[PDB]
RNA sequence: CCUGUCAAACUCCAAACUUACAGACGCCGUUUGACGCGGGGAUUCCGGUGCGCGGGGUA
RNA sequence: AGUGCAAGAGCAAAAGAUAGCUUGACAGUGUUCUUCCCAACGAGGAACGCUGACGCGAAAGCGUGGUCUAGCGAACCAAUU
RNA sequence: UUAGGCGGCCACAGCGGUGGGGUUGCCUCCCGUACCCAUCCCGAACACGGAAGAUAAGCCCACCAGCGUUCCGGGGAGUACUGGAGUGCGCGAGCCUCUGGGAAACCCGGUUCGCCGCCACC
C-alpha cells in the first residue's frame, strides 16, 4: 500500500497496546549500528533532519536505514563509525479492508511520528563523511524532504 | 547516660509451628502460662486450605517468667552470631525467640504520642551479644 | 456519553490530587452558614455523604435554611431555579 | 481617551463583538465615539480591535471633528462654539474638546449624542484587510495616524 | 517524603495526639467539649469551643492548682481526677457554660476510669453532660477508698513521706466540700 | 551508571479558554413597563455551507 | 492490600482485618436532585429530613442495606396484608 | 510555652542528621499490681497505684539541605500552545503577520529543617 495513505499526522495518537491487539511486529532490524561498543567519542557528527511533520511506516524506516548502513560499508563490516535511528514506530495504523458500515479499520502496521526539524538519523564519523552519502540514499526512501546537517565538524 | 542505655529482655516467644494442638500442653509446662492458638493465612497444598485454623501455638513470656525460662533454654542452645537480628534479637531451637531492647521502648508501644525508636537508640547485634554473653554463657 | 449515570464523566472533578488524598479536616465539615450567605459548591472527593449532583460542582448559590444538618442552597441551573441539599463538607464561603 | 471608528460592517462579525460596538454607541460603519482609557474600556476596544480604528487624537483634530460632526442628544442643531457655550459647562468647542481629552466629562454629560457620525474617508483609507503595522487601517493608530483618518472623514 | 505523590498525615495525626474521626463525631453535637486528659503525675480538664483559628478553651482545671485549695496528697489518682473535674466544672459554670460532651482523647472508655471520674466531677459542678452512670466508679473508689485499703496492707507507707501513712479519703470530702461554695477563681 | 523513544482510554505539571456568583463601567428599562408571571395561536422536529475544534474513512 | 462483580472514583487509630453483639435490609410521611443539563414528561434511583419503634456505644454518634455510579417494569385482572 | 493541654492551615511542617536541656512547675522514660479495668497468652498494651532512679528514647530548644516539598531570581522563553483578525504564503500537510494571553521539562543561584490561635504555667 502507498505512503499516501498513512503519511499525515491528522489522526489521534493511537498507541495504547492495552487497548489494541494484533499489532504487526516491526520490520526495523536494529537501532544501533556500527561500533555500538564505543561511545560518541568521534570528531564529526552528522544528522538527517526531517523537514516536515510526517508519519513514517516501520516499512520506510527499515528500507531507509538499510540503504544507509548497508552503504556505510564503504568503511567495512567492522568499520569505525556509529549509526543511530532515534525514532520508534509507536503510532499503530489501521485500514478498512460492509462498506463504510462499521469502518473502524483493523491494525495493519506501525509508524513513527516525526516533527519537522527533528533528526531521525545520527551518525558519528572521523573526517571520513561517506555518511553524507549514506543519507542522500536514506532520505530517498522516506516521504519528507530532508536536511543533512553536520554538528561537531569545523573541519571543512 | 547508661542505666537507661543498657539492654534488657522484653518477651521470649516460644512457639511450635505444627501443621494442624496436643502440643500446647508441653508449652504450658515448659513456660508456665497458657499457650495461644496460631491461625494461618492463605489456602495451600499442604492440605492447609482453611483460613481460620489452629496450626500451632505460642507463648510470650515477660520478666521473671522469661528469665526463669531462659535459665534452661539458652543452656540447650549453642549457636550465636549471624543467627542474630540486626536489632539485637535472636531465635534458636520448637522455637524460642528473644526480643531485646533498651529502657525507653514503651514510647513505641503505647497509644498516645507513640514514636518510632531512633536508630541510635536501637540495639545492635553486637551490643546484644555482649549483654547476653555476659549472663551465663558464650557467644559464637 | 455511552451511559447516563450521575458519575458519567466525573473522573477528574471527583478525584483528589495524590497529596490531598485521605480523610479531610473536620473543621470545614462543621462550618456553620447563615441564610443569605453565598457559598461555593464543590464536592470533596474524600467525603462520601452530603454530596449533590456532580453537574453543579462550581456553582455559587445562596444558603436558604437547612434540612437536618445538611444545608439547602438555591442555585440557578441555566435559567432554571433549583434547590440543592448539601452538607458543609462541600461548601465554602464566597469571598 | 481614544477615538473609535467602525470600519467594518456587521455582516458576519461575531455577535458578541457586535454587541460590544453597540455598547460603545456605534451602530453603523464610519460612526465614531470617544472612549476613556480605563481597564473596562480597554478590554472592550481590544475585543473590537479587528473591525475598528482607534487612537488618541490631537486637540485640533478633535475640535475639527466635534465642530463638523457633533450633534445634540436630539435634533439637527449644529454644535458650534455658541451652542457649546449656551448648552455646556465650557465656553467653546476647544474647551469641550480639552475636557474630553483629559477625560473630565463625556458627550452625553454635555447633552451631546455619544456618536460622531463621520463621512467616508476622502481619498479612501488604507484597507480593512490588514492592520496599521501592515499598511492597513485596522487597529491602534498614531496620534498622527488617527488624525489623518479622522480628518479625511471630517 | 519519598516523592511528590507521597501523602503526609496531618500534623496531629503524625504526633499521634488527635483522633480526627472521633473528633468529627465529637463536634457533631455542636456543644463545648469537656477535654479530659492525664499525665503520669497530673490530670487536666478543659472546656473547649470551636474557633476560627483553632479551638478556644473557656475554662480549665489542672490537678496541680488543686493544692491551691488545700490539697496535700498526690495528684495522679481518682480523687484528684474527680476534683479537677468539679473545679473545671465550676469555673465553667462561671464562664456561662451549661453543657458539654466528654472528649477522652486517645484514652480508653474503661469503667471506673479517671476520665469518667473527671466527667462525674464536671457533672456535679452543674454542667449538663451526656453520660452513663454505671460506667462510673462507685463513689468510694472516687473518694480514694481503694488506696486507703491498699495501704492497710501496709508494712511500709504507700506514700514516701507525703502526708499521712494510712491516707485520707476524708481529705477528699473536705476538699469537695470546700469547692461547693464561695472561694476565689470559682 | 550511561544511552534511544512514546500515550484517546498515563499525569509530578499545565495554559489560552469556557463557566457559577458578586462589584464596577458600559448598554438597557421604569408614558417605548424592562426582568418576570398567566393565558390564546402557531410553524417546526428531511437542512445545507464557510471557518475553528473535532471522531471515522485511502479518499 | 483489601473493600462480591465492569470501569473510573473513595477509604488506614478506616470505608480494610479480626472478635463480639445485633437485625436500621424497620413502619409511616415528606423535602430535593436525578430520570429529562439548559427545558415539559412516568416508573425507577439517590440525597437529606421528620414521626414512631429499635440496635449498638461511656458518649458525641452511627445504622433510611452492601463505599459511589448498573441489577429494572404502566393500566386492566388475580393472589396476598 | 526551662520541657504542658486543645487545635487551625495540613510536607514551608516530610526523610535523614548534629548539638543542648531538667533537686520540680513540667512531660517523659521509669517503679509497681490490693483495687476499677485488662491481655482468644503475657500489668507488653490497656487500666489503676506510685516516686528509688534517669535526661539515654520521647519531648522541648538551637542548627545542618544530602533527599522530598513550597515560593522566588536569572536562563530556558515571550519559546510550546492559544482567544480575535487577514483577497499574507504554501500543490498540500501546513505556515506567517497583526492583536489579546502565555507554559512545562531542565540548569544555575536563593528560600524552606513549619507558621498561627486559645488555655494553662517562675
Ligand atoms: Cl443536587
Ligand atoms: Cl490523656
Ligand atoms: Mg477529561
Ligand atoms: Mg439625533
Ligand atoms: Mg474617489
Ligand atoms: Mg482598499
Ligand atoms: Mg469546554
Ligand atoms: Mg452508604
Ligand atoms: Mg393486558
Ligand atoms: Mg400474590
Ligand atoms: Mg540528651
Ligand atoms: Na453489512
Ligand atoms: Na523525500
Ligand atoms: Na482529603
Ligand atoms: Na421519580
Ligand atoms: Na480461637
Ligand atoms: Na532525654
Amino acid at each position: 500500500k502507498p505512503g499516501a495513505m498513512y503519511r499525515n499526522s491528522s489522526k489521534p495518537a493511537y498507541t495504547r497496546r492495552e487497548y489494541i491487539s494484533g499489532i504487526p511486529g516491526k520490520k526495523i532490524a536494529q537501532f544501533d549500528m556500527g561500533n555500538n561498543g564505543a561511545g560518541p567519542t568521534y570528531p564529526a557528527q552528522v544528522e538527517l533532519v526531517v523537514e516536515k511533520p510526517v508519519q513514517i511506516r516501520h516499512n520506510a524506516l527499515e528500507a531507509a536505514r538499510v540503504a544507509a548502513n548497508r552503504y556505510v560499508q564503504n568503511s567495512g563490516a567492522a568499520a569505525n563509525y556509529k549509526f543511530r535511528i532515534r525514532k520508534f514506530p509507536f503510532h499503530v495504523i489501521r485500514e478498512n479492508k460492509d462498506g463504510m458500515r462499521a469502518p473502524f479499520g483493523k491494525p495493519v502496521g506501525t509508524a513513527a511520528r516525526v516533527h519537522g526539524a527533528n533528526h531521525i538519523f545520527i551518525a558519528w564519523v572521523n573526517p571520513d563523511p561517506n555518511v553524507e552519502e549514506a543519507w542522500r540514499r536514506a532520505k530517498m526512501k522516506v516521504t519528507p524532504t530532508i536536511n543533512i546537517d553536520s554538528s561537531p565538524a569545523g573541519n571543512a | 547516660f547508661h542505666e537507661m542505655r543498657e539492654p534488657r529482655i522484653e518477651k521470649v516467644v516460644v512457639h511450635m509451628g505444627i501443621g494442624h494442638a496436643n502440643a500446647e500442653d508441653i508449652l504450658g509446662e515448659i513456660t508456665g502460662q497458657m499457650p495461644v492458638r496460631t491461625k494461618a493465612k492463605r489456602t495451600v497444598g499442604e492440605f492447609d486450605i482453611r483460613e481460620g485454623d489452629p496450626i500451632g501455638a505460642k507463648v510470650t513470656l515477660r520478666d521473671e517468667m522469661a528469665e526463669e525460662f531462659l535459665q534452661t533454654a539458652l543452656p540447650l542452645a549453642e549457636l550465636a552470631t549471624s543467627q542474630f537480628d540486626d536489632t539485637g534479637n535472636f531465635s534458636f531451637g520448637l522455637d524460642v525467640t528473644v526480643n531485646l531492647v533498651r529502657p525507653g521502648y514503651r514510647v513505641a508501644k503505647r497509644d498516645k504520642a507513640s514514636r518510632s525508636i531512633p536508630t541510635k537508640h536501637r540495639l545492635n547485634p553486637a551490643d546484644a551479644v555482649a549483654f547476653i554473653e555476659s549472663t551465663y554463657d558464650v557467644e559464637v | 456519553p455511552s451511559s447516563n449515570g450521575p458519575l458519567e464523566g466525573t473522573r477528574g472533578k471527583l478525584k483528589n490530587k495524590p497529596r490531598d488524598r485521605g480523610t479531610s479536616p473536620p473543621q470545614r465539615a462543621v462550618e456553620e452558614f447563615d441564610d443569605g450567605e453565598k457559598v461555593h459548591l464543590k464536592i470533596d472527593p474524600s467525603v462520601p455523604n452530603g454530596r449533590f449532583h456532580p453537574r453543579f460542582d462550581g456553582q455559587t448559590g445562596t444558603v436558604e435554611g437547612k434540612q437536618g444538618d445538611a444545608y439547602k442552597v438555591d442555585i440557578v441551573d441555566g435559567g432554571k431555579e433549583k434547590t440543592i441539599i448539601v452538607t458543609a463538607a462541600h461548601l465554602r464561603r464566597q469571598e | 481617551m481614544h477615538a473609535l471608528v467602525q470600519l467594518r460592517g456587521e455582516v458576519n462579525m461575531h455577535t458578541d463583538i457586535q454587541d460590544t460596538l453597540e455598547m460603545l454607541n456605534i451602530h453603523h460603519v464610519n460612526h465614531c465615539t470617544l472612549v476613556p482609557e480605563t481597564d473596562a474600556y480597554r478590554g472592550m476596544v481590544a475585543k473590537v480591535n479587528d473591525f475598528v480604528a482607534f487612537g488618541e487624537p490631537s486637540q485640533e483634530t478633535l475640535e475639527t471633528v466635534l465642530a463638523t460632526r457633533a450633534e445634540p442628544l436630539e435634533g439637527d442643531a449644529d454644535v458650534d462654539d455658541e451652542w457649546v457655550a449656551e448648552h455646556t459647562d465650557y465656553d467653546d468647542i476647544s474647551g469641550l474638546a480639552f475636557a474630553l481629552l483629559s477625560e473630565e466629562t463625556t458627550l452625553r454629560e454635555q447633552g451631546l449624542s455619544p456618536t460622531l457620525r463621520l463621512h467616508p474617508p476622502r481619498g479612501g483609507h488604507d484597507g480593512v484587510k490588514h492592520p496599521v503595522k501592515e499598511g492597513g487601517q485596522l487597529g491602534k493608530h498614531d496620534t498622527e495616524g488617527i488624525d489623518d483618518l479622522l480628518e479625511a472623514m471630517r | 517524603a519519598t516523592g511528590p505523590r507521597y501523602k503526609v498525615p496531618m500534623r496531629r495525626r503524625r504526633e499521634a495526639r488527635t483522633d480526627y474521626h472521633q473528633r468529627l463525631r465529637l463536634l457533631k453535637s455542636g456543644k463545648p467539649r469537656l477535654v479530659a486528659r492525664k499525665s503520669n503525675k497530673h490530670v487536666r480538664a478543659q472546656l473547649v469551643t470551636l474557633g476560627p483559628n483553632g479551638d478556644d478553651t473557656l475554662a480549665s482545671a489542672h490537678s496541680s492548682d488543686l493544692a491551691e485549695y488545700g490539697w496535700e496528697a498526690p495528684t495522679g489518682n481518682m480523687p484528684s481526677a474527680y476534683l479537677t473535674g468539679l473545679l473545671a466544672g465550676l469555673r465553667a459554670q462561671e464562664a456561662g457554660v451549661e453543657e458539654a460532651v466528654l472528649d477522652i482523647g486517645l484514652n480508653s472508655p474503661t469503667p471506673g476510669s479517671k476520665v469518667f471520674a473527671i466527667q462525674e466531677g464536671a457533672i456535679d459542678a452543674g454542667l449538663d453532660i451526656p453520660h452513663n452512670d454505671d460506667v462510673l466508679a462507685d463513689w468510694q473508689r472516687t473518694r480514694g477508698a481503694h488506696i486507703a485499703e491498699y495501704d492497710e496492707q501496709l508494712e511500709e507507707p504507700l506514700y514516701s513521706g507525703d502526708f499521712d501513712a494510712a491516707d485520707l479519703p476524708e481529705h477528699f470530702d473536705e476538699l469537695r466540700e470546700t469547692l461547693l461554695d464561695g472561694d476565689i477563681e470559682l
Side-chain angles (χ1 to χ4, degrees):
Chain A
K1 309 236 85 72
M5 295 162 81
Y6 308 92
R7 75 191 164 202
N8 296 142
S9 286
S10 56
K11 293 193 178 186
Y14 191 57
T15 66
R16 305 299 295 284
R17 311 232 168 186
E18 39 257 278
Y19 309 109
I20 309 176
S21 63
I23 305 159
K26 173 171 61 190
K27 290 181 189 165
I28 301 179
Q30 331 143 51
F31 281 70
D32 301 302
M33 299 155 265
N35 288 298
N36 53 62
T41 50
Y42 296 72
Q45 176 198 70
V46 196
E47 327 175 62
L48 191 61
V49 182
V50 160
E51 297 193 298
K52 305 187 294 169
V54 292
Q55 299 207 308
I56 291 180
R57 304 216 295 296
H58 69 305
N59 308 210
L61 280 329
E62 184 56 47
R65 192 226 70 208
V66 175
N69 192 240
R70 187 211 294 138
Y71 172 75
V72 87
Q73 264 52 307
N74 198 63
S75 296
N80 187 212
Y81 73 80
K82 46 196 298 69
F83 206 38
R84 296 189 325 189
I85 165 188
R86 28 232 312 186
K87 302 297 182 189
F88 286 66
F90 287 119
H91 211 56
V92 171
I93 48 193
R94 353 171 180 98
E95 172 175 46
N96 178 42
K97 54 207 300 186
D98 166 89
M100 275 308 294
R101 161 178 286 185
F104 191 76
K106 66 183 242 190
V108 297
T110 53
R113 275 190 179 169
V114 188
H115 265 75
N118 293 192
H119 33 272
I120 188 185
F121 282 120
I122 306 289
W124 281 279
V125 68
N126 306 297
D128 175 62
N130 271 298
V131 33
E132 246 160 51
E133 185 68 330
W135 285 346
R136 193 215 68 191
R137 303 191 177 189
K139 89 258 204 189
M140 211 62 258
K141 299 184 170 186
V142 289
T143 302
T145 294
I146 293 184
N147 186 321
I148 291 184
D149 189 311
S150 175
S151 319
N155 311 179
Chain B
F1 67 102
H2 75 303
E3 185 185 61
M4 305 303 273
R5 274 271 308 185
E6 58 184 60
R8 76 178 188 194
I9 287 177
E10 187 207 54
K11 81 180 181 171
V12 184
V13 181
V14 305
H15 131 291
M16 298 190 271
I18 313 178
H20 40 63
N22 59 305
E24 287 179 52
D25 308 301
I26 61 185
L27 271 179
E29 305 174 299
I30 186 186
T31 59
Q33 68 181 201
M34 290 186 63
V36 141
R37 300 292 170 169
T38 291
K39 298 176 182 173
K41 292 184 177 181
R42 299 187 186 184
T43 285
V44 179
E46 40 180 287
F47 207 171
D48 181 42
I49 61 179
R50 185 170 166 167
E51 174 149 307
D53 49 359
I55 305 185
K58 78 180 177 183
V59 186
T60 60
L61 301 168
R62 290 178 150 77
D63 279 292
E64 304 181 300
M65 299 288 268
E67 299 184 302
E68 298 190 303
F69 174 83
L70 282 173
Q71 298 187 67
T72 42
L74 303 178
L76 303 186
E78 332 165 301
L79 290 173
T81 36
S82 87
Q83 177 191 47
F84 270 76
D85 227 69
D86 314 54
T87 318
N89 299 162
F90 72 103
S91 180
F92 63 95
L94 177 150
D95 308 299
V96 173
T97 345
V98 183
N99 198 186
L100 304 172
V101 73
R102 23 196 60 146
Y105 197 59
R106 165 181 173 71
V107 172
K109 291 303 175 182
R110 46 176 180 171
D111 271 355
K112 324 172 196 176
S114 70
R115 210 121 324 184
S116 198
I117 298 309
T119 60
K120 317 79 174 181
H121 198 67
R122 287 279 181 66
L123 189 56
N124 297 62
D127 304 301
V129 181
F131 173 66
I132 305 181
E133 181 178 60
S134 166
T135 310
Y136 300 58
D137 67 59
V138 175
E139 59 174 294
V140 181
Chain C
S2 57
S3 44
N4 205 52
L7 306 195
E8 169 280 308
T10 57
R11 193 230 253 290
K13 58 164 63 176
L14 295 184
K15 175 184 60 178
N16 266 160
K17 244 70 176 180
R19 278 182 54 166
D20 312 288
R21 192 244 299 178
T23 309
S24 309
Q27 184 79 326
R28 66 195 184 215
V30 190
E31 188 69 291
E32 295 280 303
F33 305 93
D34 307 299
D35 303 0
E37 291 193 64
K38 287 289 190 174
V39 296
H40 295 126
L41 283 69
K42 175 67 197 81
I43 291 178
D44 189 321
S46 299
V47 184
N49 311 301
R51 294 190 176 193
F52 52 71
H53 194 294
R55 268 178 189 149
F56 308 123
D57 235 31
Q59 279 292 317
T60 298
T62 299
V63 175
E64 298 288 43
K66 44 164 57 189
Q67 193 165 302
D69 294 318
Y71 288 88
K72 288 195 283 181
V73 181
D74 294 322
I75 58 147
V76 170
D77 195 351
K80 194 175 177 186
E81 224 169 292
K82 291 182 182 182
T83 292
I84 306 190
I85 308 299
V86 56
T87 62
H90 310 286
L91 299 180
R92 309 286 287 179
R93 273 209 184 66
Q94 176 178 52
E95 247 61 62
Chain D
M1 182 278 249
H2 285 141
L4 239 209
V5 182
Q6 167 165 33
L7 290 176
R8 295 182 70 197
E10 54 164 12
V11 190
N12 290 312
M13 80 174 254
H14 284 298
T15 304
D16 67 347
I17 301 187
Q18 208 182 314
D19 289 335
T20 293
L21 285 177
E22 275 173 39
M23 293 178 198
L24 293 184
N25 300 304
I26 92 171
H27 301 81
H28 301 278
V29 164
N30 291 340
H31 277 202
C32 160
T33 184
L34 310 175
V35 34
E37 295 182 54
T38 317
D39 294 323
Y41 276 106
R42 197 163 113 263
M44 295 197 261
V45 313
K47 182 187 193 61
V48 160
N49 181 283
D50 309 289
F51 310 78
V52 91
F54 68 99
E56 172 172 46
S58 65
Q59 181 73 46
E60 315 205 332
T61 304
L62 183 52
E63 270 177 39
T64 307
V65 166
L66 277 180
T68 192
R69 306 283 174 184
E71 294 181 309
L73 238 44
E74 286 174 43
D76 265 311
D78 292 4
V79 182
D80 56 34
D81 286 304
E82 175 165 39
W83 193 99
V84 180
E86 304 196 312
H87 285 292
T88 318
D89 310 313
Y90 311 74
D91 316 312
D92 62 321
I93 294 181
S94 296
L96 179 49
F98 178 76
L100 288 174
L101 274 170
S102 48
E103 323 184 332
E104 202 65 51
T105 191
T106 53
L107 299 160
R108 285 202 173 181
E109 292 203 314
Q110 308 305 165
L112 290 185
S113 160
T115 315
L116 304 180
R117 310 188 291 81
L118 312 190
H119 177 95
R122 340 225 190 316
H125 59 212
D126 295 306
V128 285
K129 296 199 174 297
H130 302 289
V132 180
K133 286 192 176 175
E134 271 181 44
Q137 200 83 62
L138 308 169
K140 185 165 184 182
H141 293 220
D142 243 339
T143 290
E144 167 174 45
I146 251 305
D147 281 25
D148 296 309
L149 185 58
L150 294 177
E151 267 161 39
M153 308 197 274
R154 131 261 322 189
Chain E
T2 299
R5 200 170 190 149
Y6 193 84
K7 166 64 173 54
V8 176
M10 278 188 280
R11 208 196 71 224
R12 290 216 126 202
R13 176 57 196 85
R14 302 173 220 144
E15 324 188 321
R17 311 185 130 297
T18 305
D19 174 310
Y20 283 88
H21 271 276
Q22 185 189 58
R23 184 149 193 274
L24 178 48
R25 268 126 43 186
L26 255 359
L27 297 178
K28 295 261 190 176
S29 65
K31 297 178 175 180
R33 282 185 297 146
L34 173 58
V35 179
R37 292 305 152 73
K38 309 173 307 173
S39 182
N40 292 320
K41 290 190 174 182
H42 294 291
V43 143
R44 170 138 40 187
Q46 303 164 298
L47 269 213
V48 193
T49 206
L50 230 45
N53 312 295
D55 291 309
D56 292 310
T57 296
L58 293 55
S60 71
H62 192 290
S63 64
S64 71
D65 58 287
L66 198 55
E68 180 182 354
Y69 296 78
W71 198 236
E72 196 174 349
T75 55
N77 47 56
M78 285 290 273
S80 207
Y82 173 101
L83 298 168
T84 308
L86 176 58
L87 180 53
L90 298 169
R91 288 163 174 173
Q93 283 284 282
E94 272 306 298
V97 175
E98 304 204 76
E99 58 192 13
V101 188
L102 174 65
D103 185 329
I104 74 172
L106 303 172
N107 286 118
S108 303
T110 303
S113 291
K114 294 178 279 180
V115 290
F116 283 149
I118 295 184
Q119 175 180 50
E120 210 187 319
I123 297 179
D124 289 323
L127 236 41
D128 233 289
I129 307 179
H131 63 280
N132 190 300
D133 289 311
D134 56 60
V135 81
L136 312 177
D138 79 295
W139 197 218
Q140 286 305 304
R141 185 185 174 80
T142 305
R143 283 172 43 75
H146 64 298
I147 198 179
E149 288 191 303
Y150 181 42
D151 182 286
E152 234 63 294
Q153 308 172 58
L154 189 60
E155 179 182 299
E156 286 159 54
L158 178 56
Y159 282 11
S160 175
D162 285 68
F163 80 136
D164 71 46
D167 307 306
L168 301 173
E170 290 70 52
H171 190 173
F172 172 70
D173 304 292
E174 310 182 303
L175 196 54
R176 155 162 175 160
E177 166 70 301
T178 299
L179 298 175
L180 300 173
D181 60 297
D183 74 294
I184 308 300
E185 295 170 62
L186 279 183

